[PDB]
Amino acid sequence: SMSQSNRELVVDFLSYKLSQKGYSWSQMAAVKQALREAGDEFELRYRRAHITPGTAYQSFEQVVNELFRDGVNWGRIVAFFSFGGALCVESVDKEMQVLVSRIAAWMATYLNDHLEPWIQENGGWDTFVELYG
């Protein structure tokens, strides 16, 4: 409880300092690191890249289906994460933080139903780490 938080803090910090030397705390900590890095790179390359409390999942799902028009790849999965994060930031800027959990729920729905099969068939997240880093 009060204990778990500190354990979570120690893990996060140590993960970070390990990262800074090209080491990793765990495979998950490695996935997260590559995903953040990849997002940073995508956002820097495609810098030129409409949520409300009434927006349905179908509105999001249609826009994300335009992303995976020609098919799924690691670059396009990174763009998906980047897109979700841009929606969250837009919501906080517009004073609608209340929807950041909705966007997260939508991203987990879209990932599960459409991308987890592809991810599992193409060697999982371990393969993304292997390719990206």
Q: Which residues bind ligand QHV (CB under 6 A)?
A: 38, 41-42, 45-46, 49, 63, 66-67, 73-76, 78-79, 82-83, 86, 128, 131-132
- Enter the tokens of residue 127: 């393969």
Among 5, 50, 70, 95, binds its own copies (CB under 8 A): 5
- For ligand QHV, the closer of residues 74 and 118 by Cβ is 74
Contacts of its own copies in 47-86 (CB under 8 A):
81-82, 84-86
Contact positions vs its own copies (CB under 8 A):
2-3, 5-14, 16-18, 21, 23, 25, 28, 31-32, 35-36, 39, 81-82, 84-86, 88-89, 92-93, 97, 100, 103-104, 107-108, 111-112, 116, 120, 125
